[PDB]
Amino acid sequence: LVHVASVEKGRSYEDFQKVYNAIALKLREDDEYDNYIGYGPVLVRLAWHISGTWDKHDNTGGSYGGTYRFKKEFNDPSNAGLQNGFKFLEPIHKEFPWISSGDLFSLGGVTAVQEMQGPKIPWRCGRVDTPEDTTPDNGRLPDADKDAGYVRTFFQRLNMNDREVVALMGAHALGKTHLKNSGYEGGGANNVFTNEFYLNLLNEDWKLEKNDANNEQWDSKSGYMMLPTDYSLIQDPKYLSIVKEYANDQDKFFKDFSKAFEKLLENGITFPKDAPSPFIFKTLEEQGL
């Protein structure tokens, strides 16, 4: 099973920058979503969920085939809430219908990260829409009620090591949980990409509680929350060391997240030797827009 990247016919960096810009301008404009968090976090979650179906063992799933557009994956219980991201990107696809679904979903996550003042994330084009029978079955995305050993084992399937896992989880600085989506009670939320997830873990006074959906989560007096899987990053001594490293080095966290997030988004894709180099998109700010 090989998924070869194929550049959308006649497209180059500037075509993709125009798509990035449309997404970025829309992120700026539609600012009321989710109590004024905006769509940035759900777009990052969308990019992760369409990528996180990958299985290194047989090369099924992953971002390549754009399969989230099909009902089986769209309706995965693990994807509840992501419809909001799909709806946001719909008009962008309508404006730029030449771009593949996988390229659009992944670029939405890159654009969101960068527009939320996160690291630059190099991004490659050439995901190709594959047919409905290529859609992975539900059940490949991770459970939140689990411990550090679950986390570690889970991410082996995505070929992620401890550092990559801890860096990727730093995206939980963004946005929040919603009881109605995931059975987790949301806490304090932000829409700026920083290393604060790690700072929160280390500095807050956490108490384990059971929420109204009967799920356990860690809650701080300050109004913050952590999933059991988030909290597992300070219970495991290998993960804890990395948490401390990122809490104490913003630049290191940015550079590690960038690498890990690009890898996540590219898992399963074979890039021909003469494929274009990765694109680094300018933010709206850098363009004076």
Nearer to ligand HEM, 78 or 96 (CB): 78
Nearer to ligand HEM, 81 or 276 (CB): 81
Nearer to ligand HEM, 128 or 185 (CB): 185
DSSP result, the chain: --EE--PPTT--HHHHHHHHHHHHHHHHH---HHHHT-SHHHHHHHHHHHHTT-BTTTTBSSSTT-GGGSHHHHT-GGGTTTHHHHHHHHHHHHH-TTS-HHHHHHHHHHHHHHHTT-----B--------GGGPPPS--SPPSS--HHHHHHHHHTTT--HHHHHHHHGGGGSS---HHHHS--------S-SSHHHHHHHHS-EEEEE-TTS-EEEEETTS-EE-HHHHHHHHSHHHHHHHHHHHT-HHHHHHHHHHHHHHHHHTTEEPPTTSPPPB-PPPTTTTT-
Q: Provide, rounded to whole angstroms, the least separation between the CB of residue 65 and ligand HEM.
A: 20
The answer to whether 49 is a known ligand-binding residue is no
Among all chains, which residue has been given the structure tokens 């946001």? 88
Nearer to ligand HEM, 8 or 55 (CB): 55
Q: Give me the residues that bind ligand HEM (CB under 6 A), please.
A: 41-42, 44-45, 48, 81, 142, 144, 151, 168-169, 171-172, 174-178, 181-182, 184, 227, 229, 261
Cα 51 off chain centre by: 8
Radius of gyration, CA atoms only, the chain: 18
Tokens for 214, please give them: 């009967």
Q: Provide, rounded to whole angstroms, the least separation between the CB of residue 59 and ligand HEM.
A: 20
Q: Provide, rounded to whole angstroms, the least separation between the CB of residue 16 and ligand HEM.
A: 21
Q: Provide, rounded to whole angstroms, the least separation between the CB of residue 53 and ligand HEM.
A: 12
The residues that bridge with 55 in the sheet, in sequence order, are 60
The answer to whether 45 is a known ligand-binding residue is yes
Tokens for 161, please give them: 């090591």
Q: Provide, rounded to whole angstroms, the least separation between the CB of residue 31 and ligand HEM.
A: 14
The answer to whether 238 is a known ligand-binding residue is no
Nearer to ligand HEM, 111 or 128 (CB): 111
Q: Provide, rounded to whole angstroms, the least separation between the CB of residue 76 and ligand HEM.
A: 13
Nearer to ligand HEM, 124 or 176 (CB): 176
Residues of each annotated binding site: 45, 48, 172, 176, 178, 181-182
Which segments are annotated as binding site for heme b? 45, 48, 172, 176, 178, 181-182
